Amino acid sequence: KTLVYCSEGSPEGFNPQLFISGTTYDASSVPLYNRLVEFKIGTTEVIPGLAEKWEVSEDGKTYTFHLRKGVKWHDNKEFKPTRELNADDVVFSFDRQKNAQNPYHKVSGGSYEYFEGMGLPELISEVKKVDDNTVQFVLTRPEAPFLADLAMDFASILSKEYADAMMKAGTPEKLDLNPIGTGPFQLQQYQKDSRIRYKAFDGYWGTKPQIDTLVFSITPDASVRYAKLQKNECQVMPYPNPADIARMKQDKSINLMEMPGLNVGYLSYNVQKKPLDDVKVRQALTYAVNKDAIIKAVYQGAGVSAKNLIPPTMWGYNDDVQDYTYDPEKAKALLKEAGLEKGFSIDLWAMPVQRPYNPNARRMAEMIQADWAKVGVQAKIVTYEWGEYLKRAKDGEHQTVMMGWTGDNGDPDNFFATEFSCAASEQGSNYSKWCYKPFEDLIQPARATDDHNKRVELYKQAQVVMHDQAPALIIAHSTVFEPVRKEVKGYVVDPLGKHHFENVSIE
Secondary structure, eight states, X not given: OEEEEEESSOOSOSOGGGOOOHHHHHHTHHHHOOOSEEEOTTSSOEEESSEEEEEEOTTSXXXXXXXXXXXXXXXXXXXXXXXXXXHHHHHHHHHHHHOTTSTTTTGGGOOOHHHHHTTXXXXXXXXXXXXXXXXXXXXXXXXXXXXXHTTSGGGOXXXXXXXXXXXXXXXXXXXXXXXXXXXXXXXXXEETTTEEEEXXXXXXXXXXXXXXXXXXXXXXXXXXXXXXXXXTSOSBOSSOOGGXXXXXXXXXXXXXXXXXXXXXXXXXXXXXXXXXXXXXXXXXXXXXXXXXXXXXXXXXXXXXXXXXXXXXXSTTXXXXXXXXXXXXXXXXXXXXXXXXXXXXXXXXXXXXXXXXXXXXXXXXXXXXXXXXXXXXEEXXXXXXXXXXHHHHHXXXXXXXXXXEEEOSSSOTHHHHHHHHSHHHHHHTOOXXXXXXXXXXXXXXXXXXXXXXXXXXXXXXXXXXXXXXXXXXXXXXXXXXXXXXXXXXXXXXXXXXXXXXXTTOEEO
């Protein structure tokens, strides 16, 4: 009947539209609300949510959503709904973020950060009501990742009946502070320095949670989380201390669940800077490096070797690629064919901050400098303060630079196109400055088409092109660790990084 989760900090609010933090999302969008479309648990595949089906026009610019009938809203001290979900609720949700003429646009400050971050103000031409159970979106271009954007937490549907009411009582901020949703749990109590209490929503459209009472115990210190887990004061916890992983692995009261994180760490080769314009040279520098040694010494169990830009938790992953080996002799042969038998000198920018996809860039750089020296390549390690590092790398001032990415929507486009397209190169966030027609000929059709099978084919071939042309040395993906006590049944780790309790039971 009850499950206690040791959370890592307090939510900023209960309206996910206004925030970008996973800590906040775990306490709001995940338990209380639903989206039009949802991610299938354990994957980044999209399925029906508050919309039982969708249709896409021939030109890829008009989306039709046919809404689910009979969906109930929560209630509170002040609100009791008189109708179920409809198109008004859905249009209000997106119109509030896009339209400055909407009465709720400036409410609670109007910071619609992810909405804006995903480019929706510009992409969306119009959001319209067709009837009470049908909504359309017309876009300014074809955009296959738009469905994955609508499964994101900021796209949670709010109640228009309740918003009207709170604007009527002259207390519109209550829509944001006292949540009303369609989700599996309802909010019962909250106290910022202590805990959050939820209860299974009896009216839920989906299958009712098997957990009757869900409690969040706000615990910022990770050592105290594990201590609480050991006492059975909480049954689930996130982000263990790196130091505790070995013990947790031997702890017979828990399953230490693991998964690749939604990210990647790489070293870009600026193909505009000689001799890095020659594919043979890029290949040589890649063969020369002893990547197993780097994974071991730098990540120390919190990462895994990467051979593809996207992690294996995403769809479209090509498991047929065979990664570069560690082969100095082949690197020397390559260098000779390139007419650089004698090596050359080059710079190597090391990240000044620590990230899951690259936790020790200084050590890594020293390792790569040692590897390259053996094939005659004398590297100069450079670094700058984070803002400056970013600004100069964005203008292509580097010869080689360590960078990475964390996924936003779980869609392959959000890695290949944002980081390695011709447009990204113009923009500067393609740090390889690689604009290649065979690549463009795969990622542009892939982002315009609606045929998922065709999308899978295209992204798998794109992984071949990247591998053959070696625009970047791909290094790794992080490893995520989630301790769960054995009495908890049905918990699945989420590739997008949220922590979900609506499908679990407790023994």
